[PDB]
Amino acid sequence: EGREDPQLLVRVRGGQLRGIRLKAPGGPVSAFLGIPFAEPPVGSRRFMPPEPKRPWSGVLDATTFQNVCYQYVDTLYPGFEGTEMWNPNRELSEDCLYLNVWTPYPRPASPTPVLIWIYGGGFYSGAASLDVYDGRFLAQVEGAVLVSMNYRVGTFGFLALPGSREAPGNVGLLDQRLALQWVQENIAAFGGDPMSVTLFGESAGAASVGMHILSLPSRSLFHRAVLQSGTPNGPWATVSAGEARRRATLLARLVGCPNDTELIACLRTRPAQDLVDHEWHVLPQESIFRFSFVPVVDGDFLSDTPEALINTGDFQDLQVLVGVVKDEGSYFLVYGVPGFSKDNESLISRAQFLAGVRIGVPQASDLAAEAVVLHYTDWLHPEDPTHLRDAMSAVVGDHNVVCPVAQLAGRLAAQGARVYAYIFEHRASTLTWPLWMGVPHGYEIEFIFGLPLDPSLNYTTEERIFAQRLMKYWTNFARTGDPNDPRDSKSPQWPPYTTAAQQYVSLNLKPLEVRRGLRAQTCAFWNRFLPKLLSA
Amino acid sequence: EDPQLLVRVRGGQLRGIRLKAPGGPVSAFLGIPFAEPPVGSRRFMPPEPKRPWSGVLDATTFQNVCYQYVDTLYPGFEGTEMWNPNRELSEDCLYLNVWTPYPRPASPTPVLIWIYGGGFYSGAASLDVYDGRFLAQVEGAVLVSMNYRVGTFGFLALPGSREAPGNVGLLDQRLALQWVQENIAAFGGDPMSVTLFGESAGAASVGMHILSLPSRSLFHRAVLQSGTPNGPWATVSAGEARRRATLLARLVGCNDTELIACLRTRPAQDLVDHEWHVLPQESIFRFSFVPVVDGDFLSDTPEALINTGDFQDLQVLVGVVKDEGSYFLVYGVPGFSKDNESLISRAQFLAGVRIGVPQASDLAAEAVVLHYTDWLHPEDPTHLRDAMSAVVGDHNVVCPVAQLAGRLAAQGARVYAYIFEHRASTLTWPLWMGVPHGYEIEFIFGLPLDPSLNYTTEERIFAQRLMKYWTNFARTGDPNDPRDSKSPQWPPYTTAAQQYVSLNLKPLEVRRGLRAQTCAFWNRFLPKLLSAT
Ligand SMILES: CCN(CC)CCNS(=O)(=O)c1ccc(Cl)cc1
Ligand SMILES: CCN(CC)CCNS(=O)(=O)c1ccc(Cl)cc1
Ligand SMILES: *[C@@H]1O[C@H](CO)[C@@H](O)[C@H](O)[C@H]1NC(C)=O
Numbered sequence A: 001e002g003r004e005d006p007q008l009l010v011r012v013r014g015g016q017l018r019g020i021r022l023k024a025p026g027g028p029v030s031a032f033l034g035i036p037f038a039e040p041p042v043g044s045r046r047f048m049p050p051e052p053k054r055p056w057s058g059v060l061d062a063t064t065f066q067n068v069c070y071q072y073v074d075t076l077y078p079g080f081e082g083t084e085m086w087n088p089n090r091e092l093s094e095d096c097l098y099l100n101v102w103t104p105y106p107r108p109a110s111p112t113p114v115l116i117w118i119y120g121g122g123f124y125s126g127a128a129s130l131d132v133y134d135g136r137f138l139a140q141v142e143g144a145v146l147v148s149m150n151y152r153v154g155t156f157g158f159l160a161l162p163g164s165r166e167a168p169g170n171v172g173l174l175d176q177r178l179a180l181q182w183v184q185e186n187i188a189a190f191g192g193d194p195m196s197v198t199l200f201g202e203s204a205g206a207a208s209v210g211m212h213i214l215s216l217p218s219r220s221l222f223h224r225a226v227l228q229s230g231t232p233n234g235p236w237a238t239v240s241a242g243e244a245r246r247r248a249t250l251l252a253r254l255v256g257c258p259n260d261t262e263l264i265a266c267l268r269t270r271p272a273q274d275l276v277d278h279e280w281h282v283l284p285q286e287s288i289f290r291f292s293f294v295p296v297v298d299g300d301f302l303s304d305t306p307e308a309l310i311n312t313g314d315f316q317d318l319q320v321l322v323g324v325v326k327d328e329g330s331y332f333l334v335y336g337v338p339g340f341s342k343d344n345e346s347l348i349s350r351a352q353f354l355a356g357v358r359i360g361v362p363q364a365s366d367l368a369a370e371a372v373v374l375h376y377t378d379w380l381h382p383e384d385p386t387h388l389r390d391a392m393s394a395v396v397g398d399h400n401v402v403c404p405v406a407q408l409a410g411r412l413a414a415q416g417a418r419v420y421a422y423i424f425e426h427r428a429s430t431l432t433w434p435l436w437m438g439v440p441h442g443y444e445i446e447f448i449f450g451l452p453l454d455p456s457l458n459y460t461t462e463e464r465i466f467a468q469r470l471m472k473y474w475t476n477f478a479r480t481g482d483p484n485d486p487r488d489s490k491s492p493q494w495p496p497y498t499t500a501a502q503q504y505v506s507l508n509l510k511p512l513e514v515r516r517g518l519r520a521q522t523c524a525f526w527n528r529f530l531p532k533l534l535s536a
Numbered sequence B: 001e002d003p004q005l006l007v008r009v010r011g012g013q014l015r016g017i018r019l020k021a022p023g024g025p026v027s028a029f030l031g032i033p034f035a036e037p038p039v040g041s042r043r044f045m046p047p048e049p050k051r052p053w054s055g056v057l058d059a060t061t062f063q064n065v066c067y068q069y070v071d072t073l074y075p076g077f078e079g080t081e082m083w084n085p086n087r088e089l090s091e092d093c094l095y096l097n098v099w100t101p102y103p104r105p106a107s108p109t110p111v112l113i114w115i116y117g118g119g120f121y122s123g124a125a126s127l128d129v130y131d132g133r134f135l136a137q138v139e140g141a142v143l144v145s146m147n148y149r150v151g152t153f154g155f156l157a158l159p160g161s162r163e164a165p166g167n168v169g170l171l172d173q174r175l176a177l178q179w180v181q182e183n184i185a186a187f188g189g190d191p192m193s194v195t196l197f198g199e200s201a202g203a204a205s206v207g208m209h210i211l212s213l214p215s216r217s218l219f220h221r222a223v224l225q226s227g228t229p230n231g232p233w234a235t236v237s238a239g240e241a242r243r244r245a246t247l248l249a250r251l252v253g254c255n256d257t258e259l260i261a262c263l264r265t266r267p268a269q270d271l272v273d274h275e276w277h278v279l280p281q282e283s284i285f286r287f288s289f290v291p292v293v294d295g296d297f298l299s300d301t302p303e304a305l306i307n308t309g310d311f312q313d314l315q316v317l318v319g320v321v322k323d324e325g326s327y328f329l330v331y332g333v334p335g336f337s338k339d340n341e342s343l344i345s346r347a348q349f350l351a352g353v354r355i356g357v358p359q360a361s362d363l364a365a366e367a368v369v370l371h372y373t374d375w376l377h378p379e380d381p382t383h384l385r386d387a388m389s390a391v392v393g394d395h396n397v398v399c400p401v402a403q404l405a406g407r408l409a410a411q412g413a414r415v416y417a418y419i420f421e422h423r424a425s426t427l428t429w430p431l432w433m434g435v436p437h438g439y440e441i442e443f444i445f446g447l448p449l450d451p452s453l454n455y456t457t458e459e460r461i462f463a464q465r466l467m468k469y470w471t472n473f474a475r476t477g478d479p480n481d482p483r484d485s486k487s488p489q490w491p492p493y494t495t496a497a498q499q500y501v502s503l504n505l506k507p508l509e510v511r512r513g514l515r516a517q518t519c520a521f522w523n524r525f526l527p528k529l530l531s532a533t
């Protein structure tokens, strides 16, 4: 060194790093991208827990994003921004255990609250390097220290032969945990406060945040949590040990690998792409919103099912922010369900609805499916194709996201937690998906991260103000455990969610509005009745 | 000797009585025998036609009420006593009543035939609320009402036997209908225009005449108020009927013939004493002796018959009151009383549901609980109270009615549907009960026209509106005024639009869907759940 920006040279436990000075609309920020936090989980390390990165020599260049974890790439609508924004934007590799840090420039002298993003993508996809997860705006505008990590997905992260030494399960969650431990030890070098760490994530990332809440070894690694449109409880976020074993062994057969030791050793000789090419062939039924390789109830990371853990747990020390978007189900109707497409109005017949219900609730008996159909049908217009399309969307959204979120919010509050809840109702002026899909799963994210502040992105002026409001809620929550700004106590307050009043707020261009009951009637069906009907 | 009050029917001469209605005189012929007294060896047997009589038969007074259980609930309270027998109890009770304008109509007049309700265990055509003088005077109607046997005397059945074949109370009604066909012209009635109307079990009876072929030549249109032949209480299987009669005979100390011969030796009150001890579960809105699916009067279950019937030339008017279930909570559900606001707890609600839906499995009962709970306010006592009432009213009345209306319309019938929403200013029951089962009746019969009863002037106008709908329906099969214009018209109920009207102090308002979501639960889902549980 000698002639470089002195603000971009930082030492961490593993060695020296050189970051990059980035431009945000309001000024510069420091970014340290592609910092290794584990040994590359390759070869004999495939399917194994991550090992901490061994120290390196010299100055590691941390100026670009590292590889994306090897993963299936969505083929729906090539070239279309609505899908492409979620696709990997760096080389796919099994050597992908790297994290990213954004801080103000120059770095703060007083220790700053840290936000850690965990991406979603159904546990089969995602990357910390996507444009929508760009930490520069939260760092510049709110002065946050923002961290995001890559973690293994698909078979590489979640293929499990439970009980085995060579594929114990949940290693993608152990990748996340290792990154949290890296933050505890190192974030002070960047001006971050390791004693104020807030996790946030969306969809499977939210499910992940939920796992860390429920897993004792993660508890010392963060202080507050935000779960956006996802939960550890619910029908897709976990599988039993038996089901994980069945899926792993079928996958092994499909790629020519028919003792766990021998099976796993044969799996390790397979090219990454071979595993990806068969990953979707192991689901027990035709389905949507079901993913082959997800966290497993192993009796270790998860000592019991998340449902059980949230029923009995003491959550007195927990402050949590949770919520959903207006149209959780709509995105998913195109991927499976005859009659749907982003390219037509997707009006469907009653026949397509009945068939869609079997696909959207693949675990349902005939009787359970009838109950669903009966509840969601408009008996004044039982064959109206607009209503049926919207009802199909509501079925998928409620079953997979809204009611699991309502259930989580309810259990946490009853057991000590401080809970704030929201519904996100603003549809981006820039959205490329058709109007009937409303505010789909994932489309609050660009607002939380403050992308509308980028003038080149063509958001309206009101959307910029809106984005700034949300960034304030999120960072207020991270700082204090309360999304409300003191010294603004005239602005409408966001009351905590309680079992008694069930209050949540609407997030849109208008001032906060308080509502009561998170789909209360309908969620009673999914959360109280349906389990009893399935058990008969 | 007023010659307006002297009539010859097939059995002989009758002398009626000139009555006063608020707007002029009416002729009444009360206590006309239509059958041989069903006593002694005729107990439990089909009715036989009345033998002819000599001289002039005195028809100036109401005859005996059919022998029946009398309600003990709130002694001396008008809300209950208005339904109790107002003449002496007797097994000798097969008499009918006729009201006509005075003087006798010069042209043949549409006939309305009233069939009282009372759970098939009680009721009488002599009750004040069934007074036909107002309809006769104001609308010029010829109004007929009959007594029919109730309880064991009307419905005890050993299906297959000769001596207790079942449904004889329905056969009493049918014999009275036959009597109308044969004799009503002598009063100025038109036997080619006969409209049955009835409430609760009376409405269920009307529905059974619709479903029974020999009845179909005896009337032309029907009104069903708050009751239906389909549904959970109005019929029993032959096996359950046989079980109940066999149990009753055991309880009083008694081969079909020998069993029935012994029952016939028992004084009437001994049968009544054990009438309520034969129900299979603790329950409400369930009655021991009701019409039986015999393969005779009823060729199959009402549900099967309304599903497959051809109802092309049928016109029907059907409806419900706003609070069908509220009356019944006092009768079995712990926590309910006319004397306090009956705010109940959640546990009382869960227990209430097992009583109100006695055939429900644990899982079915939980479905009901979870459907009717307001999950925004799950423990709120006033909601739980109102939910309890809705459960009982929807299960026993509202949803069976929606089902019947839908089936009849889909299979060719002309159907008109209503919800009756006006609470009488004079109502003696507490406010929380709203507009209870049975409280549209006094309005249809025109009681507010009686100044000594202190109804408001609005209620008097409302009453006249309803008498018009009912009599227009009787005359034409359509309750709308034939020439008195003005939107809003009352549109036919159809499966597509599902339109019905609200009957209250305001002008007709058209609504769509009779509790559609909730009735889909009762009518489509619950049967599936019960079958597989
Ligand atoms: C996390 C960002 N996502 C939200 C838009 C993009 C798509 N991934 S997903 O997990 O929602 C998903 C969607 C459809 C199917 Cl079929 C499977 C998974
Ligand atoms: C005739 C209209 N009724 C006015 C409500 C009179 C009361 N008898 S009942 O059939 O309604 C009845 C009473 C109690 C129970 Cl439990 C069931 C039915
Ligand atoms: C209403 O009245 C009855 C007794 O008359 C009682 O059982 C019920 O609990 C009362 N409601 C109150 C005061 O809780």
Ligand SMILES: *[C@H]1O[C@H](CO)[C@@H](O)[C@H](O)[C@H]1NC(C)=O
Binding pocket: A456, A457, A458
């Ligand atoms: C919006 O900005 C201009 C139109 O003024 C257009 O050329 C550009 O492509 C748009 N940007 C995006 C990212 O949509």
